[PDB]
Design a protein. Structure first.
Lengths: 371, 379
């Protein structure tokens, strides 16, 4: 029989939805079938997200897989938590300890702070994207205070496409007056590519500059265009193309028909997409585990019912999700009691003239290791 | 034009006084005998939220929307703000609020509280602060933190920035103050809630950093609610900001009625200190009354009974009268307890004044506005 689940996907998150579908095939099993109800929406719009959630709730889903952003995360956490509906997501982990949310994405803060120390930086620029949220900036500034770092923090959010190219050039001119050659980019893939383009245009991809790319997808970026100038470039990668699990997956993914699977037919997968595939494994494994434990699960009505009516089996589903431990595209997958990734590994990368090189890793049990 | 305009009231924990001020402001509006100033009866439906999470606020909004409101007065916090603004914007329902003014450019939100960042930046300029500690919480948004970071870059400041909103144990505040004192830090910008400002200043006094070589800039419009007595006595400088002038007619008029109220009917009126948020609440009712009087005079359609139907109706079709209601709220110019009240296109206060205080009791040292910037008085 079927287990209905919700899928809340941002508009144009094609590669993620392809990875979701590939996961549904790869992890299908004799004990049950996952049957997804897909809403595509504007994830920054809390009204839209509330309508989709309530719509899924009324159809009677057993969990929801999805994405939120800084603006809608309080909607997801509050409704999931109230109604005991588990949310599984590759989005940025929440700031506190909200229940009924399973966070596929490992925390970056610990590794980033260790890497600053590893290179012995005590003076740097930090380019942050206010449209994406501010908790990594807050951590970095708190550490700066504790450790006496001098941080030049510059907002690269809220930039009209009109003058994006011109704004970045003036930002970097001002940095050269202060003679600042060490820069961290706390942005995701698109904005990183935009900034890198302007760094190259003004000739600051040359020897004597160091960029740390502060996201979990180092090689998701177009690195080849900054690979030959002479600047140092470092980053983080949670998908290891040398693991055999990942190369086996890439054999099939790279040969999928791009017309049927948008964003496939490539030798890399964005970490967001990889975590989505991994989410299908986590959800499958949770429901299989409920059967091994002979914990029976069948039975949602009005989203805005007064009083709030949360189903009894919600806690059981949550608990099974959070007890999963598997190997996926993102390494070992395990969760603490608040659904945060634990016991994970983040590979530390540096760009060289022959391609990105893995120099070590950061682990959630210890800290930075050179390999 | 209808006989009755009804509004919504969304109140949270810790809005007892504001709730009394709301009811009293509506009673002042309704008991006016002049029919030109009172051409419709103002009604309200209030919801009290034991907590302000997204689920409970969505629930309240929808029942208010269904019952029929022409606007909603209320409070948000960091946890509820995005939900409210998103729902008001999709359904063309104007929210009027004394909460922290928002980061984003949004529609259908009238923000009674003036932004503080400009006054803060002008005073840091006036005092020539280039090296200082910045202690902040995020309960009023990120505007100030972003402005401080950006001005640090432009002016080559050394800012030691420490997030303090999650500190529960007072020994952590002590440790921070002692570490900063070892680095010879003498200047503190405190960008916190009043109650957290009080906690911090008790630690300052316990450790003797309330003496003459120290300067505390308090970045919070509830200056009169901060406990400053023990700090004055030690000799440290203090700088604060207010938006209420107790010598304006509008304020003297409100206060002489407010001090006479029965506390059984209006809790926390009478002799309790008047919070600036309660003046902002009163001011909201002036804004609402003015806008609807305007719509009446101009013979604009506001609908018979207000909003109607299901907040989660799909597709969402906003009522046609919403845009005219928003424009009428946004175009007002009135004199209130918080001075000249006007709004820009995003519902932010504009052409407002902030009064600047320093400590000795406390004396008003100057004023700030958008055009003149900081204007110090003689001395
Ligand atoms: C680039 O890396 C080398 C070490 O491999 C280091 O000596 C140099 O300082 C780095 N460049 C910058 C600008 O920090
Ligand atoms: C942590 O991950 C490692 C490597 O994948 C795994 O083999 C080990 O058993 C895990 N440890 C715990 C405590 O779950
Ligand atoms: C109030 O009524 C008086 C007497 O009819 C009138 O002169 C006045 O203009 C009215 N409206 C006001 C003051 O807004
Ligand atoms: C205290 O205020 C005076 C002006 O009255 C100012 O000149 C002095 O520098 C201030 N103290 C500190 C420690 O900044
Ligand atoms: C600002 O407010 C004053 C009264 O305080 C008013 O007379 C003036 O016209 C306003 N200015 C603008 C530019 O709106």
């Amino acid at each position: 029989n079927s287990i209905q689940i919700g899928g809340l996907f941002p508009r144009g998150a094609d590669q993620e939805y392809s990875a979701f579908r590939v996961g549904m095939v790869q992890f299908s099993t004799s004990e049950f079938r996952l049957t997804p109800h897909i809403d595509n929406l504007e994830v920054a719009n809390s009204f839209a997200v509330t309508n989709a959630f309530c719509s899924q709730f009324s159809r009677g889903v057993y969990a929801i897989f999805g994405f939120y952003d800084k603006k809608s995360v309080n909607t997801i956490t509050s409704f999931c938590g109230t109604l005991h509906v588990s949310f599984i997501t590759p989005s940025f982990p929440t700031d506190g300890t909200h229940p009924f949310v399973i966070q596929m994405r490992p925390d970056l803060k610990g590794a980033l702070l260790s890497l600053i120390e590893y290179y012995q930086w005590d003076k740097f620029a930090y380019l942050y994207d206010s449209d994406r949220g501010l908790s990594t900036l807050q951590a970095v500034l708190d550490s700066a205070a504790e450790k006496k770092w001098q941080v030049t923090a510059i907002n690269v959010g809220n930039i009209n496409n009109d003058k994006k190219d011109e704004t970045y050039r003036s930002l970097f001119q001002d940095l050269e007056l202060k003679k600042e050659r060490r820069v961290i980019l706390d942005c995701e893939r698109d904005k990183v590519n935009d900034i890198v383009d302007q760094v190259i245009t003004i000739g600051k991809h040359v020897k004597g500059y160091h960029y740390i790319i502060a996201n979990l997808g180092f090689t998701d970026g177009d690195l080849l265009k900054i690979q030959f100038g002479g600047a140092n470039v470092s980053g983080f990668q949670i998908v290891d193309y040398d693991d055999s699990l990942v190369s086996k997956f890439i054999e099939r993914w790279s040969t999928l028909e791009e017309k049927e699977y948008p964003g496939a037919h490539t030798a890399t997968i964005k970490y967001t997409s990889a975590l989505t595939y991994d989410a299908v494994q986590v959800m499958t494994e949770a429901f299989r585990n409920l059967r091994k434990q002979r914990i029976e699960i069948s039975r949602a009505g009005d989203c805005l019912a007064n009083p709030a009516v949360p189903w009894g089996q919600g806690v059981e589903i949550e608990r099974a999700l959070k007890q999963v431990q598997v190997e996926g595209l993102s390494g070992n997958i395990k969760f603490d009691q608040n659904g945060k990734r634990i016991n994970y590994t983040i590979n530390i990368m540096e760009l060289k003239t022959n391609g990105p090189r893995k120099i070590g890793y950061w682990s959630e049990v210890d800290k930075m290791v050179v390999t | 034009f209808p006989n009755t305009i009804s509004i919504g009231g969304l109140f949270m924990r810790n809005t007892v006084q504001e709730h009394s001020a709301f009811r009293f402001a509506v009673q002042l509006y309704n008991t006016n005998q002049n029919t030109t100033e009172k051409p419709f009866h103002l009604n309200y439906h209030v919801d009290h939220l034991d907590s302000s999470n997204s689920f409970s606020v969505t629930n309240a909004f929808c029942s208010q929307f269904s019952r029929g409101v022409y606007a909603i007065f209320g409070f948000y916090d960091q946890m509820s703000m995005n939900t409210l603004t998103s729902f008001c914007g999709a359904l063309h329902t104007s929210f009027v609020t004394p909460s922290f003014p928002t980061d984003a450019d949004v529609q259908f939100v009238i923000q009674m509280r003036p932004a503080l960042k400009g006054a803060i930046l002008s005073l840091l300029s006036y005092y020539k602060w280039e090296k200082f500690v910045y202690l902040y919480d995020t309960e009023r948004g990120f505007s100030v933190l972003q402005a401080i970071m950006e001005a640090a870059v432009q002016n080559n400041w050394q800012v030691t920035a420490r997030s303090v909103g999650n500190i529960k144990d007072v020994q952590e505040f002590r440790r921070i103050i002692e570490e900063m004192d070892r680095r010879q830090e003498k200047r503190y910008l405190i960008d916190c809630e009043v109650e957290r400002i009080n906690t911090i200043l008790e630690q300052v006094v316990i450790l003797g950093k309330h003496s003459r070589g120290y300067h505390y800039m308090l970045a919070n419009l509830g200056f009169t609610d901060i406990l400053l007595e023990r700090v004055m006595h030690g000799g440290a400088n203090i700088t604060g900001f207010q938006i209420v002038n107790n010598e304006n007619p509008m304020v003297q008029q409100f206060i002489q009625r407010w001090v006479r109220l029965d506390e059984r009917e209006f809790p926390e009126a009478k002799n309790a200190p008047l919070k600036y948020t309660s003046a902002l609440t009163h001011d909201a009712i002036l804004v609402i009354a003015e806008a609807f009087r305007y719509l009446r005079r101009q013979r604009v359609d506001v609908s018979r009974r207000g909003s109607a139907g299901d907040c989660l109706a799909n597709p969402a079709v906003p009522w046609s009268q919403g845009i005219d209601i928003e424009r009428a709220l946004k175009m007002v110019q009135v004199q209130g307890m918080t001075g000249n009240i006007q709004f820009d296109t995003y519902g932010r206060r504009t052409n407002y004044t902030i009064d600047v205080y320093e400590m000795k009791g406390s004396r008003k040292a100057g004023y700030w506005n958008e055009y003149e910037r900081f204007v110090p008085f003689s001395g």
